[PDB]
Ligand binder design. Structure first.
Ligand SMILES: NC(=O)c1ccc[n+]([C@@H]2O[C@H](COP(=O)([O-])OP(=O)(O)OC[C@H]3O[C@@H](n4cnc5c(N)ncnc54)[C@H](O)[C@@H]3O)[C@@H](O)[C@H]2O)c1
Ligand SMILES: NC(=O)c1ccc[n+]([C@@H]2O[C@H](COP(=O)([O-])OP(=O)(O)OC[C@H]3O[C@@H](n4cnc5c(N)ncnc54)[C@H](O)[C@@H]3O)[C@@H](O)[C@H]2O)c1
Ligand SMILES: NC(=O)c1ccc[n+]([C@@H]2O[C@H](COP(=O)([O-])OP(=O)(O)OC[C@H]3O[C@@H](n4cnc5c(N)ncnc54)[C@H](O)[C@@H]3O)[C@@H](O)[C@H]2O)c1
Ligand SMILES: NC(=O)c1ccc[n+]([C@@H]2O[C@H](COP(=O)([O-])OP(=O)(O)OC[C@H]3O[C@@H](n4cnc5c(N)ncnc54)[C@H](O)[C@@H]3O)[C@@H](O)[C@H]2O)c1
Ligand SMILES: NC(=O)c1ccc[n+]([C@@H]2O[C@H](COP(=O)([O-])OP(=O)(O)OC[C@H]3O[C@@H](n4cnc5c(N)ncnc54)[C@H](O)[C@@H]3O)[C@@H](O)[C@H]2O)c1
Lengths: 364, 364, 364, 364, 364
């Protein structure tokens, strides 16, 4: 692969291949940047056809988590674990005890959380070996009201961008998927008093939506052509593709879905038309904020006060996009890199007793 | 300025000029005295025309905080920070991360709090770099009921000075400004059963006052000439000036406003007439007590029990003023300096494991 | 002075005005940069006519120590203390106990050493209050053989620059001043087998030089016109001025004197002629290396092995000067700033247990 | 006094004379025995005519607290402080800050609490200097329900001694004094369903007693001659004197009063008659148990479960009194000394990490 | 005795009566002042007729050690232990193990050393229980060359006072007693080249003195009338009495004997005549400096460099005596009290990590 070429083109710190034979563990931990703080990342268990599939996937997700944690305002880096196995039939205790010792042997340099493939029952076996695991605690045990609240605030900011007013009484919001994250979103949007147009691949969830908030049951294939204001995709990625760009009649795209643009040329075309696209990983970053506020000792009010700042994050993305005459998906990356370089240069004076995110401190 | 002459005439320990270029921070931390404990002080952000304006302002406020923290009964010194900038447009994260590291590099020798110009959203960025910051905690998050309760107790003490009885059923209290601190004061004064005469530059707050407690709406320019007993200024400083001294018909001045006397000759004239002036920084010291009780781990009952002692503080000020045949604004300074010198001499025996206000101790 | 303008033009971290009234201390500690490590600097006691004289002097010496400690290879920053007093009649214990507590209250952020005005009898009073003081220890108690050894190595490097050969058998070295630092230098130069031409304002030291190593007694005013190879000034600063540049018949200037060029235009003219000027603060940095190796627990062999690298330091200065087509006194500053920026960027990965120069570690 | 003779006859460890001149403190701390644990004792402020009065008083109370803390089941020794002053007019902050440093300088070897003469407002000034102070905490802030509950349990045990049955439905209890400790006692005695005969020097408290529980208002001088079963003195000491022994018609004396027997010959005569006298410092030891359970972090259920054991303490006193053919006031001392000697001999095996009552341990 | 009156007239911190019955220990520890540091004092074992004899003796020696440790330049207070027993027949291990635990229970607040009555074989039993004991270590094991060296330096200073020249070639020194401390003194005085006149109650030591350095054997009763310059008493106290003042023909009294003046009226008469009396506890303080330098880890060169400063101590005593127009034995007390008050006021700024003499620090 010439793996140091791929590392050198993007400045990856480490890739790290763990293995354990009596338990059957093959894991790839990738730490991209640990400038702001420790590298928080999800632990994803999935079956890949080779090692190179898993390696490329771990490297892309490490870069993505660095820009997410930076542009969210967290003092955390970016990394990602891939466990090569099958989560239906290739789990036991022994691989997670082996894996928790491989995390404890990095000495706090990498913090893990649950992701696609692991549950909060495998981060209890890891917690028996390490402290550097999050999303576990009896105080904590559910990021979906948090992610919905952050999508709500980002939609406020994008509405003040595209229109000037953020009071959404008198707006039309089309929402695809009502799966636990757009559901609380639809709670927030009707409790403000906005009109809702929902769809889903199921109908029982659509029946729940119409019974709760009087939404409009529309078929899933033509959610794209609905004349609305704010289109909020919450189902999958690759939704904005070449096959669907002229189908839109909305000017504000702000949803919780990951990897919304299929190719960056689509983002170029959206910026040439005029659809106000707030970027994908700045809006939906509420769940990562929620699971990173556990590192203080979890408190609901502090974490919701931090999730409230996604309004300001989106507003700075649009300010940089209008200053630099670039699209907004480029403005998100440049916001994050400016925060990384500025905190490299502004935290340079010597202290022999500095605080990081894992520090021992006063109870207060 | 010959800055060591000004430091030597009043025994300032340190002045300390912080600077950071990539974040735009220019700060002046002034530590006057750290005999009793660490130097607690506010962090004030304001735009000054030069450096000398900010320097003179920081030095005056450092001396003022030393006498306030001493005469309140706290084990804390006096200092003050001035950040030279514009709080409407010259804030970001990077200057407060730089500034929090400059506080952490004093090693607990200076504790900061919010003041005129900063909020409790900038002491969360400082808290990511240091423990020596107060007014932040999720247990804590509001000094105004505390400051009003302390003004109430000091008015009890001044009423027992001027009359002998502290039960205020049958008294007349004129209050200017109903802005969040005299409001709870008016709650306390009518729940004792005293008659209220309020005024304000607004009328909606006056309407709220009349609707709540049946106060008397009087115009703001002639609040000074109202025949009353206890005049409680709660709006600005420089109220007692030469233009308004013969306007008074009250004999007890006890309000929460800072810098009440314009010049000390006015205090000389008040003492020559006979108006019982309890001093400004002894009465309104309840908010500093509230934000300094957080250093124990915040508890409401302990802090209110400590705010209750402003009765005794005012009573000792009047005892020293009658012992020493001086005015009361001089009696406040001499009370504070006697407490400083007595705790210098009475805490002189050696211990290798002493407790200060920042010490680690048993949870209990 | 508009002191933040002068701080912002050169990126000073702190200026810090200490004062103590019962002991008579007025001190100015200036910390320029603490990127590489703590700020090591001398404590200089001298009488200045005002505060502004002392302030300008402290600021210049702080910048000079930053570039010296950087270009020497040390993990130390640059700072400087000025005590405003008279060392003949205004010393006692009480000001150094007060001053040692003001250094201990920076928490290791600034390390002090002896300099022009203090002795190793005032850094014993400071040592009773702090650990952040160097040059004191009973293992240690004499930087002059170290500084001479470093001047010897730098002269080796400048001789290989100007000629190609470093074996100095068959060279002519003119040395002014034989005061304890050029004396061991003349030991090294005749034990290699090089011819010496010494001078001094005294004659008894010249008699000692001629009796020891057979040097040539030449008058002090015409040491400049002596036809030689390597001219080694070791007396004062401002030697290379406009009045003496055409007097030289030497092509290698390498001496232990501080502030050799009077103005940088003189360095421009030296580079236009062709005299190989190795810069002043790269050669004579052996004494600072000697007093900074005490921070490990002093060992003579490790410190001499570190002083041996001034050959490589001079060789990199000449490599940058030939790469960048600038003079050598500019090449020294650019070497130091490249080392500062490169160690800012190469030590950026997170550790929660990093080592600095003041760290506790294994005895081994 | 030949003070070491008095110390040697009873094995006092230390007497310790503290003094502070600028605050006016003259204190006598007496530590009798610290075998079981640290010496807990009250701090009593009172005016004595000389030093010898205070010294004899401190020595008697130190021995009394050793036998109380031993026979109660606590891991605490016995000591006592006497401050020589006047609590009406000779208190300030400075003497308690001086005194708290003199307690902190014993290093946990002596723990102080409130007693006759100090309040819980002087153990807040001491708490600013030391951890070895009890009865202060915001969790804690009232030993009187505890002392009453313990008197109730001891009366249960004495009733099973004198009769065999502990169910007190159908008994007659005469109680003198209804001052906050016999009041909750009378609550417990009527909620079991026992008949009450109360008296007091006041009548309003007697009116409260008759209105609450239907007690019988009897004059205070002839409470001694009332035909009853269990006489419970709760007012003063010296009640059982020669003038009142034939006045009794009761066979169970069990009250919360200190120093009940005037001379031990009275206890000899009570044991010769047959009145079941449970001793004074075994019954009323509930308040000391309450203020010593704060040293764990105060919990109400654990402390009440420990106060419940006074039944077993009284039962062992009567078992030793019937085994050894001695009176019961001698049986209390011998119970305590057997516990002291047995815990000297049974805790003799070496540990390098033992637990005492002041130890740091797991939160759990 | 009214022991708090005697404590209050001189500001004694503590008197502390230890006792242990199974070992037979009766000890009186007196701590006078612990402002400068911990209280260093000797442990003296002697038989006194009562307690009051021992108590008065302990109090006088505590005050004397405070002024000695202050005027010597040490960071140590003054205290003194008296053990009431007979050192010929009333020692064992058990009393020193009991006593070492009573010193460890003061927590470093009092440091003990050997004195009249104990040896360095009883401070090995104490060292098995505590660290706060000095004069014991295998590095250490002999204050007499130190005390002689300090007497030599003080005699240098008194010779420059009385004459102007300190080079003692051509002087006459009469020395009584040649017992281990004047012996090394006579070594120093003839190795400078001064003429010696020795005497002693023995003759074999006088024969050793004449054989070594050619001294002059003079009878012991008329050592006082010898026409000399510097009279150096080294035998006992009470030498300068009314019976011997006109016998002197010397003008410089500088010897190592304790308690040289019988009454202070004798010192008044010496100052009225003109005999330059350097005070007793400033000259002979070399042994206390030697045993207090062990607290750093003992090093001979550092301790001798500190003993060298007795020249400067005597010079400041004479400067204060000529400034204040008082005798010199009063000038010694006022030098010490000025050092105590100045270090109370100059070490007042807050640090949470200060160094004292018992602090843990870097090995270096
Ligand atoms: N929960 C969080 O905090 C968080 C964080 C980041 C991203 N997200 C993203 O939010 C999206 C959904 O959230 P979730 O995974 O937590 O719950 P979810 O998977 O239950 O919600 C998805 C629902 O969308 C519907 N769906 C599937 N295909 C669809 C299609 N073509 N068209 C319309 N609807 C379709 C289904 O009802 C599905 O249950 C996901 O893309 C997830 O990655 C969530
Ligand atoms: N909150 C505290 O704990 C605390 C502590 C110390 C001092 N203070 C002082 O209390 C004063 C007011 O308290 P605040 O700042 O917290 O709330 P605030 O500023 O809202 O109250 C001030 C109100 O007074 C009225 N006002 C302005 N000018 C007036 C004028 N000429 N005449 C009459 N009323 C006028 C306005 O209604 C104003 O809102 C201030 O001077 C403040 O410095 C408060
Ligand atoms: N010792 C070190 O480690 C070190 C470090 C850095 C710089 N230096 C520099 O080295 C120089 C001298 O070293 P030093 O101060 O340690 O010992 P030093 O002061 O005793 O040596 C200087 C001697 O030069 C002679 N001198 C004075 N004026 C002269 C003149 N016009 N011409 C010729 N000679 C003259 C005198 O003999 C003088 O004693 C100084 O400039 C010092 O700053 C020394
Ligand atoms: N509160 C405790 O935990 C505790 C602990 C140990 C001992 N005690 C003892 O309990 C006794 C009383 O308890 P307290 O001090 O806490 O409250 P208290 O002092 O208010 O109760 C005493 C009351 O007894 C009455 N009194 C006074 N003289 C009397 C007399 N000749 N005859 C009858 N009644 C008389 C008065 O009403 C008095 O208020 C005291 O002797 C106290 O020492 C209490
Ligand atoms: N060793 C120290 O560091 C130190 C410190 C402080 C004080 N001193 C004092 O130094 C004095 C002697 O020193 P030492 O005790 O260590 O050794 P030491 O007791 O052996 O020296 C005293 C000698 O003086 C002689 N002596 C006794 N009576 C005499 C008399 N009337 N006239 C002349 N000589 C007489 C004897 O030879 C005696 O041995 C003592 O007063 C001691 O208190 C010593």
């Amino acid at each position: 692969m010439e793996l140091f070429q791929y590392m050198e083109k993007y400045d990856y710190e480490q890739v790290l291949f763990c293995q354990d034979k009596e338990s059957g563990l093959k894991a790839i931990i990738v730490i991209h940047d640990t400038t702001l703080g420790p590298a928080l990342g999800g632990t994803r268990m999935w079956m890949y056809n080779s090692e190179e599939e898993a390696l490329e996937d771990a490297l892309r997700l490490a870069r993505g988590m660095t820009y997410k944690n930076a542009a969210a305002g967290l003092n955390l880096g970016g990394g990602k674990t891939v466990i090569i196995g099958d989560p239906r039939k290739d789990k036991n205790e022994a691989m997670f005890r082996a894996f928790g010792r491989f995390i404890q042997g990095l000495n706090g340099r990498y913090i893990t959380a649950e992701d696609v493939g692991t549950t909060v029952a495998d981060m209890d076996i890891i917690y028996q070996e390490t402290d550097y695991v999050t999303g576990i605690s009896p105080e904590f045990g559910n990021p979906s009201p948090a992610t919905a609240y952050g999508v709500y605030r980002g939609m406020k900011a994008a509405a003040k961008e595209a229109f000037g007013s953020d009071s959404l009484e008198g707006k039309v919001v089309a929402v695809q998927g009502v799966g636990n994250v757009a559901y609380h979103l639809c709670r927030h949007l009707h409790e403000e008093g906005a009109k809702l147009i929902v769809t889903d691949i199921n109908k029982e969830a659509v029946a729940r939506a119409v019974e709760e908030f009087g939404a409009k049951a529309v078929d899933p294939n033509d959610i794209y052509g609905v004349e609305c204001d704010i289109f909020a995709p919450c189902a999958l990625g690759g939704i904005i593709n070449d096959q669907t760009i002229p189908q839109l009649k909305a000017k504000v795209i702000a949803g919780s879905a990951n990897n919304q643009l299929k190719e960056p040329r689509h983002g170029d075309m959206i910026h040439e038309m005029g659809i106000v696209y707030a970027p994908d990983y700045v809006i939906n970053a509420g769940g990562v904020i929620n699971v990173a506020d556990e590192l203080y000792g979890y408190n609901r009010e502090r974490a919701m006060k931090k999730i409230e700042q996604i309004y300001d994050n989106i507003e700075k993305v649009f300010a940089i996009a209008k200053r630099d005459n670039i699209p907004t998906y480029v403005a998100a990356d440049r916001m994050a890199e400016e925060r990384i370089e500025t905190m490299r240069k502004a935290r340079s004076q010597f202290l022999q007793n500095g605080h990081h995110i894992l520090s021992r401190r006063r109870a207060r």
